């Protein structure tokens, strides 16, 4: 199992994996999200590969003040193998390497698995409300 | 009132404004924070200038999926002039201009005024928990600064 940067050739395989991990939402066009990432900086968009197949992802990022992580997924048949942790551990190292001082992540309260992973990785709850505003509406 | 990008020359004036606006925290060194933006991409770090002086800021940003905003402040003597709204609108337009599809801003839980303000600007509260992990410890640096003593 190896962690590496996303490549353009992984496009369709990643989208299929996201579908299999129930990560897609109607308001985010995954094709558009990958294109945005490619255009901006692909270097923190990581994939986990096992036997030549992409079985996990994290779309990591840095905005010049805080790090981020979206689209964290592990194929349902590859759970309990340390892949999500390997992805986040590598992301954190890439973030520190470029001077990012802190990573932030939002998770729905009902996602007890993702929440639990982050708590075990040393993430702490922030006493804040996350407010959002859509700027460009995607198609489904 | 001119909204423009932060420049090197604004460095001290902005830190003084942040101190005045009670935006400094012990765990974020403002010189380090500004240097990080300079090194990464200064373009979404906006300032508002009135009569030649910097009176407002927003440290905007984009990570390739979502936009962000930190260090939003307006000098106390320049309130009621729409400066915060003008800064945020300009940031949102710069974000749109580069294809950013959404901006998200975290606000303290106990600030109903600030929550109300953002709701009126078209922001909505997300049903999520917010977690964080410090990666580099600014407060461990032993250099002493003239600001925030």
UniProtKB/Swiss-Prot annotation, chain A:
| InterPro entries registered for this protein in UniProt | Acetyltransferase_YpeA, Acyl_CoA_acyltransferase, Bact_Acetyltransf, GNAT_dom
Q: State the PROSITE patterns in the record.
A: GNAT
Q: Which GO terms describe its molecular function?
A: acyltransferase activity, transferring groups other than amino-acyl groups
Q: Where is the N-acetyltransferase domain?
A: 1-140
Q: Which HAMAP family match?
A: Acetyltransf_YpeA
PANTHER family from the xrefs? Answer: AMINOALKYLPHOSPHONATE N-ACETYLTRANSFERASE-RELATED-RELATED (PTHR43877)
User: What name appears for this protein in its UniProt entry?
Assistant: Acetyltransferase YpeA
> What organism does the UniProt record list as the source?
Escherichia coli (strain K12)
């Amino acid at each position: 199992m190896e962690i590496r940067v996303f490549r353009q050739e992984d496009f369709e395989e990643v989208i299929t994996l996201w579908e299999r991990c129930d990560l897609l939402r109607p308001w985010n066009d995954p094709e558009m999200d990958i294109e945005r990432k490619m255009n901006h900086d692909v270097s923190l968009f990581l994939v986990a590969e096992v036997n030549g197949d992409v079985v996990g992802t994290v779309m990591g990022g840095y905005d010049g003040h805080r790090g981020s992580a979206y689209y964290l997924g592990v194929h349902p048949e590859f759970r309990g193998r340390g892949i999500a942790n390997a992805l986040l551990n590598r992301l954190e190292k890439k973030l520190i390497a470029r001077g990012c001082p802190k990573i932030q992540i939002n998770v729905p309260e009902d996602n007890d698995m993702v929440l639990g992973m982050y708590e075990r990785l040393g993430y702490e709850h922030a006493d804040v409300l996350s407010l959002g505003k859509r700027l460009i509406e995607d198609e489904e």
